[PDB]
Scaffold this active site. Sequence first.
Site, PDB file in Angstrom:
ATOM      1  N   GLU A   3      16.288  -3.759 -30.152  1.00 54.35           N
ATOM      2  CA  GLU A   3      17.526  -3.797 -30.183  1.00 54.35           C
ATOM      3  C   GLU A   3      18.038  -4.055 -28.715  1.00 54.35           C
ATOM      4  OE1 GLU A   3      19.306  -0.740 -32.213  1.00 54.35           O
ATOM      5  OE2 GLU A   3      21.547  -1.471 -32.216  1.00 54.35           O
ATOM      6  N   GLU A  18      -8.198  -0.212  -6.173  1.00 48.87           N
ATOM      7  CA  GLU A  18      -8.460   0.572  -5.444  1.00 48.87           C
ATOM      8  C   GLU A  18      -8.685   1.862  -6.013  1.00 48.87           C
ATOM      9  OE1 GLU A  18      -5.883   0.674  -2.103  1.00 48.87           O
ATOM     10  OE2 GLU A  18      -6.875   1.816  -0.953  1.00 48.87           O
ATOM     11  N   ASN A  55      15.215   0.652  -2.910  1.00 48.39           N
ATOM     12  CA  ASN A  55      14.842   1.897  -2.062  1.00 48.39           C
ATOM     13  C   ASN A  55      15.986   2.553  -1.116  1.00 48.39           C
ATOM     14  OD1 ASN A  55      11.833   1.859  -2.444  1.00 48.39           O
ATOM     15  ND2 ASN A  55      11.799   0.007  -1.005  1.00 48.39           N
ATOM     16  N   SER A  87       4.500  -3.795  -8.992  1.00 49.68           N
ATOM     17  CA  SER A  87       5.451  -4.298  -7.740  1.00 49.68           C
ATOM     18  C   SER A  87       5.868  -5.668  -7.748  1.00 49.68           C
ATOM     19  CB  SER A  87       4.950  -3.527  -6.555  1.00 49.68           C
ATOM     20  OG  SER A  87       4.692  -2.347  -6.450  1.00 49.68           O
ATOM     21  N   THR A 132       8.371  -3.485   3.925  1.00 47.99           N
ATOM     22  CA  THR A 132       7.378  -3.274   4.845  1.00 47.99           C
ATOM     23  C   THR A 132       6.527  -4.445   4.846  1.00 47.99           C
ATOM     24  OG1 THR A 132       6.007  -2.509   2.730  1.00 47.99           O
ATOM     25  CG2 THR A 132       7.199  -0.641   3.999  1.00 47.99           C
TER      26      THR A 132
HETATM   27  N1  LIG Z   1       8.612   3.651  -3.646  1.00 47.90           N
HETATM   28  C1  LIG Z   1       7.159   3.125  -3.823  1.00 47.90           C
HETATM   29  N2  LIG Z   1       6.991   1.807  -3.789  1.00 47.90           N
HETATM   30  C2  LIG Z   1       5.917   1.540  -3.848  1.00 47.90           C
HETATM   31  C3  LIG Z   1       4.778   2.639  -4.241  1.00 47.90           C
HETATM   32  N3  LIG Z   1       3.653   2.113  -4.370  1.00 47.90           N
HETATM   33  C4  LIG Z   1       3.849   0.715  -4.262  1.00 47.90           C
HETATM   34  N4  LIG Z   1       5.065   0.344  -4.123  1.00 47.90           N
HETATM   35  C5  LIG Z   1       5.642  -0.851  -3.588  1.00 47.90           C
HETATM   36  O1  LIG Z   1       4.394  -1.895  -3.803  1.00 47.90           O
HETATM   37  C6  LIG Z   1       4.725  -2.932  -2.979  1.00 47.90           C
HETATM   38  C7  LIG Z   1       3.631  -3.683  -2.740  1.00 47.90           C
HETATM   39  O2  LIG Z   1       2.447  -3.570  -3.653  1.00 47.90           O
HETATM   40  P1  LIG Z   1       1.527  -2.418  -3.473  1.00 47.90           P
HETATM   41  O3  LIG Z   1       1.489  -1.399  -4.485  1.00 47.90           O
HETATM   42  O4  LIG Z   1       1.305  -1.808  -2.196  1.00 47.90           O
HETATM   43  O5  LIG Z   1      -0.022  -3.325  -3.901  1.00 47.90           O
HETATM   44  P2  LIG Z   1      -0.660  -3.247  -5.087  1.00 47.90           P
HETATM   45  O6  LIG Z   1       0.567  -3.247  -6.203  1.00 47.90           O
HETATM   46  O7  LIG Z   1      -1.301  -2.154  -5.478  1.00 47.90           O
HETATM   47  O8  LIG Z   1      -1.618  -4.815  -5.340  1.00 47.90           O
HETATM   48  P3  LIG Z   1      -2.768  -4.758  -4.595  1.00 47.90           P
HETATM   49  O9  LIG Z   1      -2.537  -5.461  -3.408  1.00 47.90           O
HETATM   50  O10 LIG Z   1      -3.877  -5.521  -5.124  1.00 47.90           O
HETATM   51  O11 LIG Z   1      -3.464  -3.368  -4.204  1.00 47.90           O
HETATM   52  C8  LIG Z   1       5.358  -2.193  -1.605  1.00 47.90           C
HETATM   53  O12 LIG Z   1       6.131  -3.120  -1.120  1.00 47.90           O
HETATM   54  C9  LIG Z   1       5.987  -0.864  -2.019  1.00 47.90           C
HETATM   55  O13 LIG Z   1       7.404  -1.027  -2.028  1.00 47.90           O
HETATM   56  C10 LIG Z   1       5.004   4.206  -4.339  1.00 47.90           C
HETATM   57  O14 LIG Z   1       4.378   4.716  -4.592  1.00 47.90           O
HETATM   58  N5  LIG Z   1       6.761   4.206  -4.342  1.00 47.90           N
END
Ligand SMILES: Nc1nc2c(ncn2[C@@H]2O[C@H](COP(=O)(O)OP(=O)(O)OP(=O)(O)O)[C@@H](O)[C@H]2O)c(=O)[nH]1
Lengths: 434, 426, 426
Positions: free
Chosen positions: A252, A69, A204, A138, A177
């Site tokens: 290590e 994205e 979190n 993630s 979420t």
């Molecule tokens: N705390 C925190 N969590 C994040 C952040 N960005 C993504 N996440 C975590 O990423 C999880 C889901 O992955 P996403 O980042 O939304 O989606 P993606 O990894 O970009 O993968 P795509 O679906 O292909 O766009 C969510 O449950 C969030 O908790 C962030 O900036 N801060």
Amino acid sequence: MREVISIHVGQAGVQIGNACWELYCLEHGIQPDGTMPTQSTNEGESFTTFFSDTGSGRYVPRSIFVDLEPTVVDEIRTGTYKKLFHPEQMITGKEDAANNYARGHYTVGKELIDTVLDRIRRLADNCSGLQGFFVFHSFGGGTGSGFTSLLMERLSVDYGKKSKLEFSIYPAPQVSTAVVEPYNSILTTHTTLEHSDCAFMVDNEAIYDICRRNLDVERPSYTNLNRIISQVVSSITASLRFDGALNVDLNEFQTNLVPYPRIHFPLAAYTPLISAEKAYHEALSVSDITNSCFEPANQMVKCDPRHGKYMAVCLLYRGDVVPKDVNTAIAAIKTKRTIQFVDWCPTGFKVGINYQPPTVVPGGDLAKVPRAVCMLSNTTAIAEAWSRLDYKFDLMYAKRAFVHWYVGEGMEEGEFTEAREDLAALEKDYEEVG
Amino acid sequence: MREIVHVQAGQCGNQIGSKFWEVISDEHGIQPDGTFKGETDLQLERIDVYYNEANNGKYVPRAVLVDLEPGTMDSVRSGPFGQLFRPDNFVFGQSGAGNNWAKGHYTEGAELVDNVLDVIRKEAEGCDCLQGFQLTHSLGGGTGSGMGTLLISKIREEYPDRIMSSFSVVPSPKVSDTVVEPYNATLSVHQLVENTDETYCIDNEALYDICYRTLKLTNPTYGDLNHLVSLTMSGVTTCLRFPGQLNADLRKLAVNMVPFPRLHFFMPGFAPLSAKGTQAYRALTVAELTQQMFDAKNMMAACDPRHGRYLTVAAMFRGRMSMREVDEQMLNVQNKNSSYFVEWIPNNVKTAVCDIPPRGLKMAATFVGNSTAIQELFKRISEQFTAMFRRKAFLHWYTGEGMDEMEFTEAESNMNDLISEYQQYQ
Amino acid sequence: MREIVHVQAGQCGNQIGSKFWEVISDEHGIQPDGTFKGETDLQLERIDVYYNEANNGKYVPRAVLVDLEPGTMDSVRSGPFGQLFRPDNFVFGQSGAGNNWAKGHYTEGAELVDNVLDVIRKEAEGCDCLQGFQLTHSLGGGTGSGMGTLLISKIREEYPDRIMSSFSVVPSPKVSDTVVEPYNATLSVHQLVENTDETYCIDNEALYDICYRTLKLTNPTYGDLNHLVSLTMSGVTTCLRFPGQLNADLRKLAVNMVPFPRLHFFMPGFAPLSAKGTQAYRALTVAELTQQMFDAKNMMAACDPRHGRYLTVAAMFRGRMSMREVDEQMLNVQNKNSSYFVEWIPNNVKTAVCDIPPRGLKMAATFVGNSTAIQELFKRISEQFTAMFRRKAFLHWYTGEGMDEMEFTEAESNMNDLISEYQQYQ
Ligand SMILES: Nc1nc2c(ncn2[C@@H]2O[C@H](COP(=O)(O)OP(=O)(O)OP(=O)(O)O)[C@@H](O)[C@H]2O)c(=O)[nH]1
Ligand SMILES: Nc1nc2c(ncn2[C@@H]2O[C@H](COP(=O)(O)OP(=O)(O)O)[C@@H](O)[C@H]2O)c(=O)[nH]1
Ligand SMILES: Nc1nc2c(ncn2[C@@H]2O[C@H](COP(=O)(O)OP(=O)(O)O)[C@@H](O)[C@H]2O)c(=O)[nH]1
């Protein structure tokens, strides 16, 4: 010399990398435009693991930003940190996967995976001492799970022996979420057991508990949560970016902390992590914060550490710390009996002391403290964190809810069944070894 | 003439000598440029034993500096006395052992062993007759315990004649330092009982107990802990570097002590040791320096001296002393402590006296003992080594490198025969 | 040669010596650095008896300083002559007795007894032949009366041969000092009649009556009351430290006096004693110094000398004196006071004369007597000890520590047999 490459996949890869590389510009004295001031050359002592040299001190980060994205990537291409990174290192996507596996494992990823593996190889051929990988992802993301498992499926074919490190966020059993996060966490555990050296998890909520009580931050958001994780990231690199009396490289870390090639998932902890006022009325000694390491209000994953069994506890200290009380306080931990080991490992300790104290972010909520500990503790409380997520996955799978997105995207339903028998014996092995 | 090289390998032994060469520099009146500034030629007439003078007196130490990474190179190079070392010897790799024996022995150490093997050859070709080697490394870590282990297995192919000093730190019973620390001990000593002549088992734990009681120092700097290792090693080779009424080389220190070709595992001792303010309040007599040497306080390892028996007592005394008072009290300890000796070996005291004290005192004593309570050093590690082999943990860091399971058990049988040999005469 | 250590335990005996070592420092011409500044070598030729010279003449006193708290340590250390003492001997605990015998004996004193036991051993190993011990402590308090009580029970295991000087203050009939003061007396003397050789029962009450009449001092500083204890003790050991026409060691002072292995409870005396302005108006004759010694005024304890009988009269005279006038008047007291002596022991006067007076006078007299009116010292305390045992008060501070009830009554029977033995010959 030694040179380490970072890869940032997903939106969690974007803004955590927007904090860690922001923090490293402070700890080496590098201006964010791309060049360095001449005052920070003496501070710049063995900074070569991340920053290539260009023309006159212009330091590109050995870092790759991968996203399906273009939105959050443009935040990097708007702020002050635009001119620091390299443009062809930024490879963007256009169509989103929307937290779906085969949309992130086959659909948009396979049009962009061949572009990025060249940029891996274009940068890594400069290395003579290529150590490891900082891959940030993630567990429920489309590219967070579907592309990350495919990416580690391909670099082990390419480089193999050289090390890897994964940082990620443990999905909370109560507050989270996306509803497909019980699905994708089983999927990102399926084939990444074989293709990952180590993977770390944070909660979190376990950040929030110290934010409200000790930091006294009653309006936190994803701004300040990126700073707290980045201090744990920076404390590992302080063993490598500087000259310490007894320090440790990335090969290590996995050698000490992996007792068996499947159970290789510890977590992190950081102390002293308080506000700027409470350090004034208190003299934080070595025995203060080391005893603060092993209390359940300090772990970075909200679980029960007393119901877990410690197997290999790793300790990295920062700041001017003498080793005498170190050799006392870890023994004074052993005078207490609540810290439970396994019967076969009494010698699961790691000693690391660096000269440099951690330096705090400008305008942040922290305080300049000389002493700090980055605690790493592999335990059997991870198994109790497996059962809370294995309960979520199977019952939604039994009614076959939300299957009608996974079907038409190039994906099979029997792969859900094989990951169930795969994750069943995994949490068994905590009790089998324990 | 009688020439000795000093080789450092692993992160432990690289920084031990970095303070140790300084005292050797300062006991003979030289500079970081190697410029001789000794006033009396007593500091020059045996300067050749550790040095090779070349091109207007810039003495270079006969030293080899080996690491698997360039991390410890620049710190010694940019640090104190960095200009003194020859840049021909700065041989290193780009791996890092990661605390893995088979990396340091089979995988990565097998590459860098060839480069310094010619360097061992090169300085030994420019001399008339070599005397023996001294080696500082580790037994807890992975680099020195994996690479310096294999180096002794190739010295005997070049020189099967001379002596081998392998000084290395050992684990402690209280707090382990690394995770694979019982793995790095049994696999190393398996090669140490094959081709070595002396090891000094120095505990990291008891060195603080020396500093906490005698020195009273609240802030133990790692320059200061190796400083007490530094003054121990310089007192051993005082005969080859200084005259006196009785000279005793390293071979005489070897032949007097080791009774059987395995039992050569000795702990060192040093007196006097105290803080600043207790200088005048005690006495600098032969009697006060005697009983300090035979205390559990002076035991540099954390083993109990009244849980063993002294076999060979080596008294390397330094300073202008009265020989009869040395002859008086070395009799008097056996009239007190006849249970504390082995019974069937008469006259357990070996005395060597050089008439030159170290810099900073007026009369000193360098002790090396053979207690059979060092049997407990190999009792405590043989259980920790067999604590994790019973669950087969960390096997994928060794068999993944290509280590045999019998390589454990062959070392494990020879580890347990070693404590049977202390039991033979106790 | 003949060597004597001086040990202080409890808050009483720790500050008695702190003024007493000063006179011993000043009678031999030394400094707080221990620097000898005596003009005549008469102050040096017997300096060794209380000192161990080491490393350019900084004499250290052969002294051990023990406390259960660090309170009395720093006050002596930062006070006068604080730099003279050896910091090796500063052994202490962290409890405080709280005026409890079984804490000082069984509970807390049993921990710290091991550390100074080697310190008693250490200075006694560096000498040829020991002579005897001198000990200052209390009998009213809890620390010295509980910990110094047990110390004599372990000296006899090391040295069952020599003499034991146990100088300690005693309760007074007028005003009690502590609440458990009759408890700290009967339980201590139970161990004092077992293994000790002399006690000097000095009353705190009568020392003011000395100062109120002779010295006329309105403000009794505790430095000044121990100053009169200081000059008493230095006159006893004047033979071992100074020559003369007749020398008499501590054993000769022992063997002449004690007739039976319990009756060794002696009170001291000193003359001359007066204020400033009465110097010239009286006479410094043998006759004027004689009759002062045999007054109730000179009785340092608050017991009545005409309510008892002198058994052994010890006359330690100091100064250049005529022997015949000493021989004249010591006859003349028995021609006056034949009722005041025991009848069946002839020639009750023992005379020892050193020809050196103390600093500040021209002719002095150090008296130690044996009145059988000291029987009343153990009459008055045996009722106060049995005043509270009849109501079983304060039992939860002793049985709560683990004290036997028979431990009271076994001491109580041996307390009452003691006054029967003064009654045997009175
Ligand atoms: N705390 C925190 N969590 C994040 C952040 N960005 C993504 N996440 C975590 O990423 C999880 C889901 O992955 P996403 O980042 O939304 O989606 P993606 O990894 O970009 O993968 P795509 O679906 O292909 O766009 C969510 O449950 C969030 O908790 C962030 O900036 N801060
Ligand atoms: N006293 C002291 N000991 C050290 C120092 N550095 C390392 N060590 C010891 O060396 C051991 C680790 O071995 P090391 O050489 O660092 O690991 P390796 O490089 O993989 O061989 C540990 O037990 C440390 O106690 C130091 O500066 N001072
Ligand atoms: N002359 C004099 N006597 C003292 C001094 N301090 C304590 N005493 C005496 O010591 C007795 C109390 O014993 P003490 O040692 O203080 O109690 P303890 O610490 O529990 O043993 C009292 O009878 C006091 O008269 C002092 O400074 N000068």
